[PDB]
Amino acid sequence: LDSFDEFIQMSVQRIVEDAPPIDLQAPPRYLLKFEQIYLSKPTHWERDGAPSPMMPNEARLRNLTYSAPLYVDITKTVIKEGEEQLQTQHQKTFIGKIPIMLRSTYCLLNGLTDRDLCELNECPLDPGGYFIINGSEKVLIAQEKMATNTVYVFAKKDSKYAYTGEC
Amino acid sequence: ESRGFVENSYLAGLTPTEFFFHAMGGREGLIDTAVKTAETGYIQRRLIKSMESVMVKYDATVRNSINQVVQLRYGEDGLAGESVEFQNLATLKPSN
Amino acid sequence: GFVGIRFCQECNNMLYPKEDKENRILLYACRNCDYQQEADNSCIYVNKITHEVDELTQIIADVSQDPTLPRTEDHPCQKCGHKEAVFFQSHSARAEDAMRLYYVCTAPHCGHRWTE
Amino acid sequence: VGLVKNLALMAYISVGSQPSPILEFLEEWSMENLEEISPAAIADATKIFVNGCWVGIHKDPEQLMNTLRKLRRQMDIIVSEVSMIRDIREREIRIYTDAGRICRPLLIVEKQKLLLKKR
Amino acid sequence: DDEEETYRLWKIRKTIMQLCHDRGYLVTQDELDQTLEEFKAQFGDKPSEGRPRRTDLTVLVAHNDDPTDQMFVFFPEEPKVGIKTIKVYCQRMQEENITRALIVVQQGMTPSAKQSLVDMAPKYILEQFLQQELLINITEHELVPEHVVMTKEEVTELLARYKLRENQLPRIQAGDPVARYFGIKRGQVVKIIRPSETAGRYITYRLVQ
Amino acid sequence: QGIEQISKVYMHLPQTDNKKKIIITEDGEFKALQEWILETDGVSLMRVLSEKDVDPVRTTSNDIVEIFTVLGIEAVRKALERELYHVISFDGSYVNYRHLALLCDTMTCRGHLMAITRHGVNRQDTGPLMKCSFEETVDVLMEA
Amino acid sequence: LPKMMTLHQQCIRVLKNNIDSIFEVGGVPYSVLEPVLERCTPDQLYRIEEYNHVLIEETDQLWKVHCHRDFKEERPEEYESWREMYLRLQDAREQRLRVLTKNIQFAHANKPKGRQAKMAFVNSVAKP
Amino acid sequence: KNVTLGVPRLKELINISKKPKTPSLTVFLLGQSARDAERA
Amino acid sequence: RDILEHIIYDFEDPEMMEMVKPSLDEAFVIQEQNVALNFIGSRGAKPGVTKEKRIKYAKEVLQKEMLPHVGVSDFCETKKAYFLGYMVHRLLLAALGRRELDDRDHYGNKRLDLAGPLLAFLFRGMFKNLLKEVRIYAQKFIDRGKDFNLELAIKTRIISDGLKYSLATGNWGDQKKAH
DNA sequence: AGAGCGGGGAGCCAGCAGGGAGCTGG
RNA sequence: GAGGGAACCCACU
DNA sequence: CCAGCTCCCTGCTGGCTCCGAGTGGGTTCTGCCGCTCT
Ligand SMILES: [Zn+2]
Ligand SMILES: [Zn+2]
């Protein structure tokens, strides 16, 4: 839950920031800059198109993906020859759907008491920590890796190197 | 105690350091089983495919599929191994 | 004894050993620029194959602050008389042949390190 | 076997933090930058690593680690999940704020006494 | 050193003449068991000085059944062996009308010299032996069982008894150390007598390939 | 001094009859003689055999290839049998002799050391279908 | 403990285990009390000196053992006994630490701006 | 002596390895050389 | 002198000097920064025919791609030099036996990518893909046309179905690169 | 407009460069 | 009186 | 006299093929969204 909350609150916005703005010339120049993300609560749109607050049992039963729409604020500036810069503020532009970990901050079961969870046909003993993808509960197994930014010196065997430092 | 000698019995119960060191010891046996199965099976397969057509012929010789003589008699005595027994030579050991 | 790197002054590079037969002596010459200098020590290169018998000079006194090191009060400091001292084995790759204990005085401002 | 592992019950994997408060505090807690020092001062001083970045050296590493532990223990500038390691023999202080570090809570002992009291 | 080289020369001569007795050549019992002192008395003590000279160490033997079937054992002084030494040795063989020789080299032979040996093998049979290989008798080792070279009539009786072809027998390489010891060519059959854990004695037959 | 391929030599006096010098006395008993024996960490068998006061009969290696190149094919057959027996009977396990003898005779029937691998088995005169059944199926059938 | 101890050593080892038990020394001279006070830590010395004031002018050299352990880069100036220097630098360092805490909390949270995700509640028809 | 046994030695045997893990000799001595430790 | 000051912090230590002697002897023939950058760029991914192109490529490797954590911006080369000298110093310490070799199985040398970092890696790749497709669409409608609609430029299927696919299958990457 | 379709190791082998005798030629 | 394959994961002896 | 040049041994590097047997159960994806043309 803590890793998913850090990903949603901090990592998505940081990834959007570190992506460079798009500079496009044929001539007219267009600069696209993605500014501020917005994440909603997990909503379902049927074929009618009316949004609804999508519950985890609805996602499990109807084989839905328990995902929340991710909007973003985009600025499009126009740079012509002999013309000032033109600003277009495309506020809250939908760019996809982020699957939501159960009982995380942006899950609809967040902050609910056990009575509210039982009224929603959820088990209060259920830990969360998983996603609902096409109605199937998916857990992300943690993955070990070597630590970054650290100097590690080993001795490669049966090689041309007596010792090797790695970072 | 530091380097993994467990001074307790299973009835007495292990200290936490002894418990962790015993887990380190038993993980070795689990690893040994799991990684020895594949190499042993490959050894068995290679041993089988090297000798599968070697057989006792009707002239009591041991030959392969190429009909080359491997042994002139099976086990050098021509006897099946499911009926020989451990016995003692009476005249080998005693003095003159 | 060991020989160290002697550096040039014009370009601060490495001086390499060389001889002059007109003076018939030894000089450290820089071969990036044209600097030359008469060499003080005749020893150009030395092996220390079995000269790893000492490990006290690599020990620092800061290990007196290590809480994971064993402390004893039966080995008083010779330099200052403090009763307590940490002891440890050598941490080198040369310590495979020796479990010899080294001692460091745990009194501040002393840092005296000795053996047995 | 051995490759798939499980968490211990009180094990917590760190979530990550920004090094900026620790870096600012180190800058005005008598640590001198690498850009402003001659190399001759590096031999006797303690190298300071923040998320594996050598940011400077310190002349008094013991009181620096005491100060850093005091800051982390009262949940000041340093947050609780930050790891601070003093390699005493190698004269290094490594501060890690990144994610993925697995840690566990331990009771603090000062002078052979628990800081956990009956209160 | 002169003493260790004299010991080497005595050991080489003893192994050579054990080999010659094993090959069927007439080597008398007096010169099988020649002691180091007897070798010192007959030949010398200081090979670097030259009292035992390798050229003087040349052994001429005659086969037991055929007294005109003689074989040489040559000891080149030079460590390698070239074409010139081979030409000198085969000229000596031609002028003494002998078709078999052993060449006990110190370091080895040049590849051209081995090519000359295999080229002249139809007329004169010349065997390469390192001194290192000949410093012991490998047939006296406990791992090496008894090898007996079979006559052609024995081979035909063997193949008639077991109704075999030659390629159905087990094989031994012509470069095998025991095969090189007995000086056997391709097509011959060696009868191996060995002890058996189960039967007591077992006889194998190996064709030279 | 010494021989280049041999790094370390371990002297020991064996207390067990596995590596002793059994002799038949004048009375006629089998008497075990405790005699000092050496072990090596490298293999230079021919030089060791040539050395002074080294037994040129009982001295042996555990290297199969050098025993084959020094003493021949029947000697490496016996050495292979001894080493396989050592591996089997380390645990006190017993396998009947005919199985070990058949494996060693299979590995030494063609004059050289035929390894129990594709490079030993698939280079015999056996049919292409047997070879492709073992290993390198497509390559064997293309060679055929 | 395979050691023999006379009365001095017995009393000072017991008291060297429980320094904290001392409230008021009575009338012991420092020259007697010299061992147990050298194996001690400066807060306990402040406690002892503020219950047993008559020891103060005796213990100042003792403070040097603390000063070169806590302020090893320093030296006293003139008209500075080691106790008053240790207390002045100790309180100055605590005040510097408190000012730094109130800086890097105020100037990192309240002063600058950090960007994160905000809740939408849009329910947009951009995904129909 | 660190002589290898078990499955790795069986693999080193049935695969004719030119590089055994622990190659070794068992050197036996002749005469008085075998009887005293100094000439051994 | 400067290189050894960055590598060897105590110049009164002769064995570190002895071990850095072969590297100094090997690299004596290069004596300028531009010649060294040329030597680096001669062994690049694609060596440029222009020497100045090789200088730019070597500078880009040494700044952007060599030790990004100590510094990636311009004029941050002294921190990178101290860190590289620290790596060489650690290598010499291991060579002397003065410092123990690192342990791969030591679990303080390991980090655990949880749902956060893994989803961040996914979303970084897929936001790069979404910006790539937006760039292609807007490039097409500024090349022949004059204007492009941004709402039609964004393919939400990229982020949505990529996250859905990687969470559904467990293959952590792209759909066309599952192997 | 809208229906349907084209675009990790471990151990073998051979193939190359480096060596080092040795015949023909002056 | 019997119409998919493939990939991956978990598990069993 | 003595320089010249060709063809077999060793060694390094690259390719290449192998890595236990047998069982349950699951999910996902194959098979894709731009069209040019009436
Ligand atoms: Zn210079
Ligand atoms: Zn002291």
Three-class SS string for D59-101? CCHHHHHHHHHHHHHCCCCCCCCCEEEEECCCCEEEEECCCCC
C41 and C68 housed in the same domain: no
B34 in contact with D, Cβ within 8 Å: yes
- Residues written for chain I: 179
Question: Which CATH number does the domain housing residue C69 bear?
Answer: 2.20.25.10
Q: In angstroms, rounded to a whole number, what is the distance separating the alpha carbons of residues C83 and C70?
A: 14
Domain count within chain C: 2
Nucleotide nearest to I179 (CA to C1'): K7
Taking C1' of L7 and every protein CA, the nearest residue is E112
CA distances from C84 to E21, G13, G47 (A): 83, 14, 25
Q: Which long-range contacts (CB under 8 A, 24 or more apart) does I15-19 make?
A: I15/C2, I15/C48, I15/I96, I16/I89, I16/I92, I16/I96, I17/C4, I17/C5, I19/I92, I19/I95, I19/I96
Amino acid at I62: L
Print the domain residue range for C93.
48-116
Establish whether the CB of F81 is closer than 7 Å to any nucleic acid atom in strand L. no
Q: Are I110 and I103 spatial neighbours (Cβ–Cβ below 8 Å)?
A: no
Q: Are D97 and D50 spatial neighbours (Cβ–Cβ below 8 Å)?
A: yes
Establish whether the CB of F115 is closer than 7 Å to any nucleic acid atom in strand J. yes
Q: Are C26 and C39 spatial neighbours (Cβ–Cβ below 8 Å)?
A: yes
Give residues after which chain I gaps, C-N over 2.5 angstroms: none
3-state secondary structure chain C: CCCCCCECCCCCCEEEEEEECCCCEEEEEECCCCCEEECCCCCCCCCCCCCCCCCHHHCCHHHHHCCCCCEECCCCCCCCCCCCEEEEECCCHHHHHCCCEEEEECCCCCCCEEEC
C15 and C33 housed in the same domain: yes
Experimental method: cryo-EM
**D58's tokens:** 């310190």
Q: In angstroms, rounded to a whole number, what is the distance separating the alpha carbons of residues C102 and A36?
A: 61
* Residue E159 burial class via C-beta count within 10 angstroms: exposed 0-12, middle 13-18, buried 19 and up: middle
Residue at token pair 């280079």: F123
Q: Which of B68, B72, B77 sits opposite E198 (nearest CB)?
A: B77
* Residue G97 burial class via C-beta count within 10 angstroms: exposed 0-12, middle 13-18, buried 19 and up: middle
What's the gap in Å between the CA of D73 and the closest CA on chain B? 27
**E53's tokens:** 């000279």
* Residue E44 burial class via C-beta count within 10 angstroms: exposed 0-12, middle 13-18, buried 19 and up: middle
Tell me how far the alpha carbon of residue C23 lies from the centroid of ligand 1, in angstroms. Answer: 22
**F131's tokens:** 């070879």
* Annotated binding residue C8: yes
Instruction: Count Cβ neighbours within 10 Å for each residue of E96-134 and write b for 16 or more, e otherwise.
Output: eebebbbbbbbeebeeebeebbeeeeeebbbbbbebbbb
I9:D102 CB<8 A:
no
C55 and C103 housed in the same domain: yes
Quick one: which of F46, F84, F39 has its CA closest to F68? F46
Nucleotide nearest to E110 (CA to C1'): J21
Report the Cα H10 to chain-centroid distance in Å: 15
Tell me how far the alpha carbon of residue C39 lies from the centroid of ligand 1, in angstroms. Answer: 15
SS3 D115: coil
Report the Cα G93 to chain-centroid distance in Å: 10
DSSP H helical segments within B1-96, as ranges? 16-51
DSSP 8-state symbol, E146:
E
Ligand index nearest the alpha carbon of residue C104:
2
Q: Under 8 Å CB-to-CB from F69, ≥6 apart: which residues? A: E177
C112 and C80 housed in the same domain: yes
C99 and C66 housed in the same domain: yes
C14 and C52 housed in the same domain: no
> Of the candidates C26, C47, C68, which is a domain's last residue?
C47
Establish whether the CB of B75 is closer than 7 Å to any nucleic acid atom in strand L. no
User: Which domains are seen in chain E, by residue range?
Assistant: 1-136 (3.40.1340.10), 137-209 (3.90.940.20)
Instruction: Count Cβ neighbours within 10 Å for each residue of F76-85 and write b for 16 or more, e otherwise.
Output: bbbbbbbbbb
C43 and C55 housed in the same domain: no
Quick one: which of I84, I95, I113 has its CA closest to D98? I113
Q: Are F100 and F85 spatial neighbours (Cβ–Cβ below 8 Å)?
A: yes
C103 and C116 housed in the same domain: yes
Q: In angstroms, rounded to a whole number, what is the distance separating the alpha carbons of residues A146 and D25?
A: 29
Q: Are E53 and E13 spatial neighbours (Cβ–Cβ below 8 Å)?
A: no
Q: Are strands E70-74 and G118-119 parallel, antiparallel or unpaired?
A: unpaired
What Rg do the C-alpha atoms of chain D give, in angstroms?
17
Q: Are D13 and D101 spatial neighbours (Cβ–Cβ below 8 Å)?
A: yes
Ligand index nearest the alpha carbon of residue C78:
2
**E182's tokens:** 């007995």
Q: Are strands A43-45 and A86-99 parallel, antiparallel or unpaired?
A: unpaired
C31 and C55 housed in the same domain: no
C89 and C52 housed in the same domain: yes
Q: Are strands E146-149 and E171-172 parallel, antiparallel or unpaired?
A: unpaired
Q: Are strands D46-50 and D53-58 parallel, antiparallel or unpaired?
A: antiparallel
Amino acid at D105: P
Q: In angstroms, rounded to a whole number, what is the distance separating the alpha carbons of residues B73 and F73?
A: 19
I69:D54 CB<8 A:
no
Amino acid at E57: L
CA distances from D9 to B62, D13, D15, D104 (A): 64, 12, 17, 9
C58 and C99 housed in the same domain: yes
| Quoted resolution (Å) | 2.8
Q: In angstroms, rounded to a whole number, what is the distance separating the alpha carbons of residues I127 and E176?
A: 71
C64 and C114 housed in the same domain: yes
